[PDB]
Paper text:
The human CDK-activating kinase (CAK) is a heterotrimeric protein complex formed by CDK7, cyclin H, and MAT1 and acts as a master regulator of cell growth and division. It regulates transcription initiation and the cell cycle by phosphorylating RNA polymerase II and cyclin-dependent kinases, respectively. Here, we use high-resolution cryo-EM to determine structures of the CDK-activating kinase, a master regulator of cell growth and division, in its free and nucleotide-bound states and in complex with 15 inhibitors at up to 1.8 Å resolution. Our structures provide detailed insight into inhibitor interactions and networks of water molecules in the active site of cyclin-dependent kinase 7 and provide insights into the mechanisms contributing to inhibitor selectivity, thereby providing the basis for rational design of next-generation therapeutics.
Furthermore, as a proof of concept for high-resolution structure determination of inhibitor-bound CAK, we re-determined the structure of CAK modified by the covalent inhibitor THZ1, which has been shown to disrupt super-enhancer transcription in human cancer cell lines, and we determined the structure of CAK in complex with the high-affinity inhibitor LDC4297, a pyrazolotriazine-class compound that exhibits anti-viral activity, a property that is of particular interest given current global health challenges. In contrast to THZ1, which acts via a covalent mechanism, LDC4297 is a highly selective reversible inhibitor of CDK74. The map quality of our structure of CAK in complex with LDC4297 at 2.1 Å resolution was improved by locally refining only the approximately 40 kDa CDK7 density. The structure reveals that the substituted phenyl ring assumes a similar conformation to the equivalent group in ICEC0942, while the ether-linked piperidine group was refined into a boat-like conformation, though structural flexibility and sampling of other conformations cannot be excluded. The bound ICEC-series compounds exploit hydrogen bonding interactions with the backbone amide and carbonyl of CDK7 residue M94 in the hinge region that are shared between all compounds, leading to a relatively well-preserved positioning of the pyrazolopyrimidine core within the CDK7 active site. These interactions are also exploited by other hinge-binding kinase inhibitors, including the CDK7 inhibitors THZ1 and LDC4297 (see above). Notably, LDC4297, which is highly specific for CDK7, carries an even more bulky substituent at its ring-up benzylamine group, and the recently reported CDK7-selective compound LGR676840 exploits a bulky biphenyl substituent at this position.
Residue numbers in the entry:
A (entry chain H): 244 to 250, 278 to 296
B (entry chain J): 10 to 44, 51 to 165, 173 to 311
Write the structure that this text describes.
């Protein structure tokens, strides 16, 4: 049974915080 | 207060765990009783506050919390085993389907967790618990923290965390999910470091020292120390039994750029999971016996 999917400062950027996460959260 | 104690299971830094029975329904649960004058332990309160807001089959469910003055016990669902015991048992064979199933359950739980803006931050095989029906669950949310508003065992710590990242996203879980994956493929800790220097040394000797193209602004992390240019063993030499799709999944999880590192959703969308063979059903996953 094959699986199928179902539905900032440079420091933050280096860590993975892209300033779009906050906007999407807010 | 209606739970009877049956078996003692162990002690940790924060609490002691006992297998217990709900007298009203004869259900098996795990009671984590927290072992000054600051009140209830902040780890217990953190787990309570996070697990009250979450409900997914691949996240450990907080069922109750009771206690006396400044002492509290947390009632979770009872999990039969963890992924560390699965990996360390030489009598168990970890076929590609089994690895895919563990990967899929971990990533689905992580996708729900990250969608609700919570980072686990303590992902490792002993924190990936399995039950008698094969459903993996993220557990030990004493380190979990909400993310989005402007850590991890050393072996599974992401390089950004090892390099001092105060602010970070889903990658710090994703990297751990990579390491667990590698530990599933090798039956041995992929990057068993000693200090915060030796861990990065092993990471860079195995996967290659990242450069600015592979990880921009890597030098802006607070504890950033630059190592030597290690070529890094090719991924198909380390994981000689890994297929091309599995190698692509590993490469995505082990990208040094956390932004470029695949999130849980796009990891779930990789062809490795939709390729043949499909992940084995949870009821057919190996049991450590
Ligand atoms: C995370 C919650 C509190 C939970 C739910 N279930 N659960 C088990 N179940 C048994 C178990 C799970 C994983 C590995 C081993 C065992 N085990 C069975 C018999 C003896 N151990 N152990 C521990 O915490 C465990 C792990 C280590 C700390 N004390 C016991 N915590 C739990």
């Amino acid at each position: 049974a094959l699986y199928e999917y179902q539905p900032a400062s440079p420091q933050d950027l280096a860590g993975g915080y892209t300033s779009s996460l906050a906007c999407h959260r807010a | 207060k209606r739970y009877e104690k049956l078996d003692f299971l162990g002690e940790g830094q924060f609490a002691t765990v006992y297998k217990a029975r709900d007298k009203n329904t004869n259900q098996i649960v795990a009671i984590k009783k927290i072992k000054a004058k600051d009140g209830i332990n902040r780890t217990a309160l953190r787990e309570i506050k996070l697990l009250q807001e979450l409900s997914h089959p691949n996240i450990i469910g907080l069922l109750d919390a009771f206690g006396h003055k400044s002492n509290i016990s947390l009632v979770f669902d009872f999990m039969e085993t963890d992924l560390e015991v699965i990996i360390k048992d030489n009598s168990l064979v970890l076929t590609p389907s089994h690895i895919k199933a563990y990967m899929l359950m971990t990533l689905q739980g992580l996708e729900y967790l990250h969608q609700h803006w919570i980072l686990h931050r303590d992902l490792k095989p002993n924190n990936l618990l399995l039950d008698e029906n094969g459903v993996l669950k993220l557990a030990d949310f004493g380190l979990a923290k909400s993310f989005g508003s402007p850590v991890v065992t050393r072996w599974y710590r992401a390089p950004e965390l090892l390099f001092g990242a105060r602010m970070y996203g889903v990658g710090v879980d994703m990297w751990a999910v990579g390491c667990i994956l590698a530990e599933l493929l090798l039956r041995v800790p992929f990057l068993p470091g000693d200090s915060d220097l030796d861990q990065l040394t092993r990471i860079f000797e195995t996967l290659g020292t990242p450069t600015e193209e592979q990880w921009p602004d890597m030098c802006s992390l607070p504890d950033y120390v630059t190592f030597k240019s290690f070529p890094g063993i090719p991924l198909h030499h380390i994981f000689s039994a890994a297929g091309d799709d599995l190698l692509d999944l590993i490469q995505g999880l082990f990208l040094f750029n956390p932004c470029a590192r695949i999130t849980a959703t796009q990891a779930l969308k990789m062809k490795y999971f939709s390729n043949r063979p499909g992940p084995t059903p949870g009821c057919q996953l190996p049991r450590p016996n």
